[PDB]
Every structure is written in C-alpha cells, then in structure tokens.
Amino acid sequence: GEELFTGVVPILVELDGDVNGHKFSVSGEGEGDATYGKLTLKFICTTGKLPVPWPTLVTTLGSGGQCFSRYPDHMKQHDFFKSAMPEGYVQERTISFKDDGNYKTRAEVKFEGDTLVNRIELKGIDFKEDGNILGHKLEYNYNSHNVYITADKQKNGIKANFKIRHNIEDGSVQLADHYQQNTPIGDGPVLLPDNHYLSTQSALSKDPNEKRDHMVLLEFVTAAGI
Known part of the structure; x- marks a missing residue:
C-alpha cells in the first residue's frame, strides 16, 4: 500500500526495445521520495547508442514517477499506483507522434524486496527515415x-x-x-x-x-484536480 512509500525507495528499471527494426536495451537505477513527490533516475543504453532520442523515452522509462506522486491529504484515496503495491500493476501504452510513428508498450511496475522495479517491452513502428525521431531533431x-x-x-x-x-x-x-x-x-x-x-x-x-x-x-510529480 501507501506504507511502502514513506521513506526513500530504491528503483531498478529495465527496457528491451525495438524501433523500426533497431534493437536496444536500457538499464536504469535510482531512488524516489513520495513525501517530496521526487524521483531521481540514471538511464544507460547497454547495447551501444540509442537509435531514438532520450526525450522520447522519458514517460516510459520514468513511468515509476507515477508511483512516487505527492498526493495531498484530501486525495490519498485516489492513489491507485501505491495501493497496487507490493504485487504491482501491468501497464500498456500507445504513444503517437504526430506526422510520424508510434511506440506500443507492455510494462510491469512491482516490488522485488525493498526495490520498486519497472520492466518494459517496447515496439516502435512506422517512423519516417528523416523524421524528428530517427533524424534526431x-x-x-x-x-x-x-x-x-x-x-x-x-x-x-x-x-x-x-x-x-x-x-x-x-x-x-x-x-x-x-x-x-x-x-x-x-x-x-x-x-x-x-x-x-x-x-x-x-x-x-x-x-x-x-x-x-x-x-x-x-522528476517532480504532484496530484491535483479534486
């Protein structure tokens, strides 16, 4: 539950990707603090150079930041992410770049000991050869x-x-x-x-x-709206 996020929680992120046939892997490690709604992570491409720009991967690689959100007192009953823990949740996304291709994911955010783990399978298709993404603009x-x-x-x-x-x-x-x-x-x-x-x-x-x-x-995540 929300009891597991009272202190500083260590994070481990692993991603296997495939964009337009180019295959890559990303490892990441860090820590999150739900009291401050803070998340600090360092990502490394373990297969050499990343065939997509790093900003296009932030929401996928830093999806654990949604678990470290600072939810105000009158809103702590709307925290799905923390309540799904330790067993966690399965996450599926479709990121659509306008006038370009898309990323389709399958992720899993759960606890493995005192460490929150985020493992992702990413597949990117239909990207333009000299578009904003493959052209690194x-x-x-x-x-x-x-x-x-x-x-x-x-x-x-x-x-x-x-x-x-x-x-x-x-x-x-x-x-x-x-x-x-x-x-x-x-x-x-x-x-x-x-x-x-x-x-x-x-x-x-x-x-x-x-x-x-x-x-x-x-990353800094805070909840609001209610």
Missing part, C-alpha cells in the same frame, strides 16, 4: 505535463490520457499523444480513483563522468 529537454486519470471499473484498473510537448531544434514542437491503461497483478483491493490529474515536471541532464549513452532524470 529533438532538443535534449522536456516540458511539464498533466496525466489525466480516470477509473476503469470494468477491468479493476485505471485509464490515463495525456499530451507531451517535445521541443524541436528549428522552433517547432512535436506532439506525442499518450494512451495508458493499468490493471493490478494481485487479487487484493486496489483504490479506484475519481477523475484527477498528476502535475508532472521533468528535468534532463548528463553525467560528465559517464562515457556511455545516458540520461539523468529528475
């Missing part, structure tokens, strides 16, 4: 986003819909529409929320001592 940055959550009582889980604004180097913005569905792994009672949002902010940086392809993610 995205700036190494990120903007704020609100994750609009609604309950799916039929499947005992939740649904989420949101838009990500990716800044391009020429001045344009690349829209990435997100569709999300979560369902618990366990049979025990989970918290089914009313309509609300997760106010999320993401800051990206580099580690000047890491020679490998990496990304440092600092």
Whole structure:
C-alpha cells in the first residue's frame, strides 16, 4: 500500500526495445521520495547508442514517477499506483507522434524486496527515415505535463490520457499523444480513483563522468484536480 512509500525507495528499471527494426536495451537505477513527490533516475543504453532520442523515452522509462506522486491529504484515496503495491500493476501504452510513428508498450511496475522495479517491452513502428525521431531533431529537454486519470471499473484498473510537448531544434514542437491503461497483478483491493490529474515536471541532464549513452532524470510529480 501507501506504507511502502514513506521513506526513500530504491528503483531498478529495465527496457528491451525495438524501433523500426533497431534493437536496444536500457538499464536504469535510482531512488524516489513520495513525501517530496521526487524521483531521481540514471538511464544507460547497454547495447551501444540509442537509435531514438532520450526525450522520447522519458514517460516510459520514468513511468515509476507515477508511483512516487505527492498526493495531498484530501486525495490519498485516489492513489491507485501505491495501493497496487507490493504485487504491482501491468501497464500498456500507445504513444503517437504526430506526422510520424508510434511506440506500443507492455510494462510491469512491482516490488522485488525493498526495490520498486519497472520492466518494459517496447515496439516502435512506422517512423519516417528523416523524421524528428530517427533524424534526431529533438532538443535534449522536456516540458511539464498533466496525466489525466480516470477509473476503469470494468477491468479493476485505471485509464490515463495525456499530451507531451517535445521541443524541436528549428522552433517547432512535436506532439506525442499518450494512451495508458493499468490493471493490478494481485487479487487484493486496489483504490479506484475519481477523475484527477498528476502535475508532472521533468528535468534532463548528463553525467560528465559517464562515457556511455545516458540520461539523468529528475522528476517532480504532484496530484491535483479534486
């Protein structure tokens, strides 16, 4: 439940991807603090260079940030993510880049000891050869986003819909529409929320001592709407 997130929880993230035939793997480690709604993670591409830009992977790789959200006192009954723990939940997403391809995922966020683990299977198709993604025209940055959550009582889980604004180097913005569905792994009672949002902010940086392809993610997630 929410009892497992009172202190600093260590995180381990693993991702196997396949974008337009290009195969890659990403490892990540870090820690989250639900009291501050903070998440700090370091990702490394274990297969060499990443064939997609790092900003396009933030919501998938940093999906654990949704579990570390600071929910206000009058809202702690709308926290699905924490209530699904230790057994966790299965997450499936469809990220649609406007005028380009899409990413289809299958993720699992659960507890393995004192460590929260996020394992993802990603498949990307229909990307343009010299488009914003495969052409690496995205700036190494990120903007704020609100994750609009609604309950799916039929499947005992939740649904989420949101838009990500990716800044391009020429001045344009690349829209990435997100569709999300979560369902618990366990049979025990989970918290089914009313309509609300997760106010999320993401800051990206580099580690000047890491020679490998990496990304440092600092995320701040707070709940609101009710």
